[PDB]
Amino acid sequence: TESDWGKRCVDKFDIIGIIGEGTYGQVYKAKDKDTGELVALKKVRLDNEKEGFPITAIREIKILRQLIHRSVVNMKEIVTDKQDALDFKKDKGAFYLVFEYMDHDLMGLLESGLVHFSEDHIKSFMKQLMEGLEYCHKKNFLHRDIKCSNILLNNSGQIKLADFGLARLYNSEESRPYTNKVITLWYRPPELLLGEERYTPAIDVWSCGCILGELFTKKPIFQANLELAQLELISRLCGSPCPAVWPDVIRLPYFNTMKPKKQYRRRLREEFSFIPSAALDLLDHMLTLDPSKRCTAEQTLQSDFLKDVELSKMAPPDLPHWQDCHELW
Amino acid sequence: TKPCWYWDKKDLAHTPSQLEGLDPATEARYRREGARFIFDVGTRLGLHYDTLATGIIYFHRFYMFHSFKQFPRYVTGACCLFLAGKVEETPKKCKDIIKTARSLLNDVQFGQFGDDPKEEVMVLERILLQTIKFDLQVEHPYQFLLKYAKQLKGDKNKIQKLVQMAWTFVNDSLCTTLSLQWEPEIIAVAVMYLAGRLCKFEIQEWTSKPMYRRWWEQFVQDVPVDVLEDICHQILDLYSQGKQQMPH
Amino acid sequence: MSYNYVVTAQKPTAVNGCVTGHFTSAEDLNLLIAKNTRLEIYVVTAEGLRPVKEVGMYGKIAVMELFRPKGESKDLLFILTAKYNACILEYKQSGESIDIITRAHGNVQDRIGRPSETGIIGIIDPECRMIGLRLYDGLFKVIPLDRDNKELKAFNIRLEELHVIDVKFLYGCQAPTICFVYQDPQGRHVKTYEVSLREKEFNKGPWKQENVEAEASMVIAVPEPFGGAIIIGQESITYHNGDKYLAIAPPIIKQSTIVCHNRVDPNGSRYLLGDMEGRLFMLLLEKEEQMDGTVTLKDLRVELLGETSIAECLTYLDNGVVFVGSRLGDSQLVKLNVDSNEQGSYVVAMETFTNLGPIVDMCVVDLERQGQGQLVTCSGAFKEGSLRIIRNGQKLHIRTVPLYESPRKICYQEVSQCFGVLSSRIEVQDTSGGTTALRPSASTQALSSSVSSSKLFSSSTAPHETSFGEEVEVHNLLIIDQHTFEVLHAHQFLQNEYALSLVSCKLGKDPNTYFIVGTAMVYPEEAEPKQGRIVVFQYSDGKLQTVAEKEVKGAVYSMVEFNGKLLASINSTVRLYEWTTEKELRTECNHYNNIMALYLKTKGDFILVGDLMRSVLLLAYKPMEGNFEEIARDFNPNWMSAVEILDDDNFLGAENAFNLFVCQKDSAATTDEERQHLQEVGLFHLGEFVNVFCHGSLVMQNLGETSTPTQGSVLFGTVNGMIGLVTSLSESWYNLLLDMQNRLNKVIKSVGKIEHSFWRSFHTERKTEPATGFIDGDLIESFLDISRPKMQEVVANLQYDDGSGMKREATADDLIKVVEELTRIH
Ligand SMILES: COc1ccc(C)cc1N1C[C@@H](C(=O)Nc2nc3ccccc3[nH]2)CC1=O
């Protein structure tokens, strides 16, 4: 049946090439021989034999067979290398995680400068992303790695969230000890910079707000290489962490340790004056220092900016594929 | 989409082990020892109750597709617990699971691990994953026992006595094939039903509908008493066979 | 890691901007011509221009304006680089010693902002109270010109109008006032604001908004006699000032888009206007004086003067001499006469300044049978299209071959003693239903000619409607003699067929040498071409014969000869064709994991592919199997403009951000993943847009082979005419030259006080990185031009390495000899 994963062989896919590198193995693009559907294969190398099958992959197999949403990538099946006949101990073959192939990735399109977003395009983009995050957040799952690279976009304008390798369940009642350093520095929330270690689902919201700004500027909002320097960049725009705006900031491990140069005032509305007001309100709320005052995903979907957006009109972004090779004369 | 993990009692006479000449009593014994091995090892390591149960469910499912004569049970159990830890985010190093197993198993029993215990366990992970069809998410009677108990309103001491007795019945049902016959929601109701009979409590009064004598139908739809009685009979059989008695 | 060396063989020739003022002295009139990264200062004489000084800047010159604040004797120069380095410069001369003073400097980049579509704009107040900068959508930046602002500190005023087309400071206003054209969903408008340095905000402007032409492009600040502004569009020119409104819409300007404007008479009575087809117009302001004593603007008139080279910038200079600053063609000095000549023209050319124009493609060929290659470049566009033959002579000798149509690709066929050139000319839909060319050109003046009769796409049934006046490109293959450079034959391709690729080679067991062209069927409706041809031609006895055609399902962007087989890239696919004994192309194998296979290069059985995005991929042909294999791909996202193979392990690329990088095969083998990953080991900000990489050297070998420390030779051509050369170094030689750069940067004074390390840092809007693996040869070669005290200062405590001498001291004379050997590579 369709449900007996791990047995079908990777022979069933014609490998087209390597579309990227992944934590547990290299990622390949393949065409299904039977249906002709283009897929993506994630190679899981269990030959390491240090701790067996990588937990990062286990999380992606556990979570993505539960989550069904348009804005969440679908794992179609799991296939294997030709296994050694009747000798599992000799068998060192790897497993492949099949996913629906996506034409482009956000960071790729932005880095190549080949994409331009209108307000309506940003509306359609953010609505899908936040709706997917709401589905995941309602199922009490935390992504913990929201980056531009992990947002896959089809040419139709559909958005899907993808790398669930650092994803874990959130318990509101029982505060659970979590890994402190979980998102890439450019999209990391302030609590994790100050070392909360017991983060809320609001870590993912802060990231999506950083993306919201990036879609308007075409450049990441806070790009730094050191955790303190990131806090400084955030502090300049969002304001310095202080007890008045974040009453519990004093309980954070590094609040006394990590300090901005000054107690900067919030300037978000001023520095993003070119952003539309409906969006600017969303950004101010998504980039709130206090995780308890930071907006939820649902609250973003019930915003003036995203609520009356209709996803029937996908509004696909501007991806010129001709006369882009030629230079404007 | 998703696999079916439930068989009929009658289907258990045609497990791979039965067909290799193992008699029903022996496979049941092997299943209890393996499950209890998983439980004892994980408790020593400080593992969450869900992690222990997940390993036991992996274990029970495994030997619905393979024979006990070809796969030594304690190696299988250790592998299940090792994987369960990664699935449930309570991970342990394979070497540590092996160490704890050495303490609890005698020398003959540890012989199953062969000359290299860690390797025999790590090598099995491939077969375990393919066998469980990569359906790693498992639900256990515990969550439903608490979700349903929270909706009961009444004497705090009487309800808490119901919960703990039922909780013990859940821990005892992991040694059986009930996990392979009935969804966890039914098991949670069955153990509430059993404890209620034993404590002479009438749970209906604590539910929102006090004249609904089939109190469970508000938690689990379409469950006949036939089922709940079959489960109760199976749980109490473990107590009558052993020397242990009902907790009360 | 990898070590490479990059030098300029020819400096940028295209004119990016030109201003006139009194920069060297209050009495002299100067013309400051700006080329990319280069500033040229002249003095206007009666015969022409007198050069006085040229400087380089560590930045692309984006804004250049001359201003004279109260208290200064002479004009000061403001320059802003494309990386947002700002400075105010002063000319100072002490007898024979000429130097450039950095009076103020700083970097004005904002942490958060959206770069504007119409680019950086810089304007200065008529009272020189402030510098206005339009860098980001929705923001106006003010640098106030107070004596104390030596760091050029500035503030931003919120601008409601997000999409601004053009802005100027107006004349005759009570406060500093800006006039700008902006676009919102309702069309284009002209609006005014007043700028308050005291309040650091905008106040209501002197006159109300007016709706203007949809394609309103340029704003002219009319001088005090008239006041107000003139708005130039595609069809109309309008004057605005409070209640006064004029509009002239003469049919002559609708024909071609106007790109530049300049003031002739300081009173504002006359302006110069120029359009893309080269026509130069005079815009006349007809005055009317009222008995009140006030002069009003009565009417506007436009008069055609003649033809110049397509001009990016115009400057009136003095008398009738006008400087035509051309980026697409040769710049010029032309004289405006009061009386027309017998052809009706008032414009007569005086001098012609060489501009290698956009170098679309180039080839290195030893035409004169010497020891050196001559570089034949596809240069210029439209009526300025030319072929340029460049040979090393101390100056470069350049021969110009006018085509009057756009050249696209060039290849050399020695068997035929001729060159094959792809060209496109502009025709316009005319009343016949066909099209008519605006002027004769190479493809129409060929000795013999032919037109494709292919029936491949003839089935059509796809409608493409035509409106009178719309432009079309007509593509041709030109056969050009290598000695006379006479067009021997022109082959015109199908209607709507673009010629994108060209090769000259023999295939298989076929002894004939062919011209092979790859094309794309280009329809305005299509996002990406879905039809195309590979055409095999034979040039024989003065006639081009069509040998074979292969239909493809896309655009043949690139082709290259591969061991007797034809390697072609069709959209995403990279394909290898065999040439059968039946003289037809047969597909052997394909590779599909590409976004767009724009660029191809080969070496042995290895293929380097460069996509529109995802940088470069190393493919290999496995002859035992008859297929392609992915050896190693660069996973960093970059938009490619050109690629080249340096050696079997190093690969060179050019970004659309004016950056160069080198990727090396990891050459380790522990994991397969490591081999598959190409590590970018070189990063360099060139500052030019590289279209064509080409192995070869213009230097003539004295006898046999003489080699400096540099090994290998790659020439490259750019959009601004700059020609550069990339070569490799040993680890020992890199370290020596790198350590010396750091010493030279401490000694050499930069114009604008721009840090050299900053200038060469890799730069995309999203990422900025320090340069690596590249020696700025133009910095190294400047050691020979610094004074003796500075030379000895540089060599202090300098040690050699990785040689037979171990750690060797260096003297000023030792390094002078080393650099002079490096100057011989070009
Ligand atoms: C021909 O394209 C490539 C060639 C070479 C490289 C290096 C990249 C690309 N690609 C493939 C696209 C992608 O990332 N596709 C994807 N990645 C997935 C991960 C998980 C699930 C589905 C996925 N689909 C974006 C992109 O530029």
Numbering used by the authors:
A (entry chain B): 715 to 1043
B (entry chain C): 20 to 267
C (entry chain A): 1 to 393, 708 to 1140
Sentences from the paper on this structure:
Interestingly, multiple other, small cyclin K degraders have recently been published. Structural evaluation of HQ461 (82), Z11 (83), Z7 (84), dCeMM3 (85) and Z12 (86) revealed that all promote the formation of an analogous ternary complex, and sustain the hinge hydrogen bonds and the π–cation interaction with DDB1 Arg928 (suboptimal for Z11 and dCeMM3; for HQ461 and Z11 we observe hydrogen bonding with the side chain instead), while also displaying interactions with additional residues. Those include CDK12 Tyr815 (hydrogen bonds for Z7 and Z11), Glu814 (CAr-H···O interaction for Z7, Z11 and dCeMM3), Phe813 (halogen bonds for Z7 and dCeMM3) and Ile733 (hydrogen bond for HQ461). Some compounds instead contact Arg928 via hydrogen bonding (for example, HQ461 and Z11) and hydrophobic interactions (for example, DS06). Small cyclin K degraders such as Z11 or HQ461 show less optimal engagement of the ATP pocket than CR8 derivatives. Accordingly, while CR8 displayed CDK IC50 values of 40–200 nM, the smaller compounds show weaker CDK association. DDB1–CDK12 complex formation and cyclin K degradation can thus be achieved with small, almost fragment-like compounds.
Recently, several unexpectedly diverse compounds were reported to deplete cyclin K by linking CDK12–cyclin K to the DDB1–CUL4–RBX1 E3 ligase. Here, to investigate how chemically dissimilar small molecules trigger cyclin K degradation, we evaluated 91 candidate degraders in structural, biophysical and cellular studies and reveal all compounds acquire glue activity via simultaneous CDK12 binding and engagement of DDB1 interfacial residues, in particular Arg928. Crystallographic dissection of 28 ternary complexes demonstrated that despite considerable diversity of the molecular glues, the overall complex architecture is highly similar. The low-affinity DDB1–CDK12 interaction primes the complex, while the ligand, through filling the kinase pocket and bridging over to DDB1, drives robust association, offering a rationale for the unusually broad chemical diversity observed.
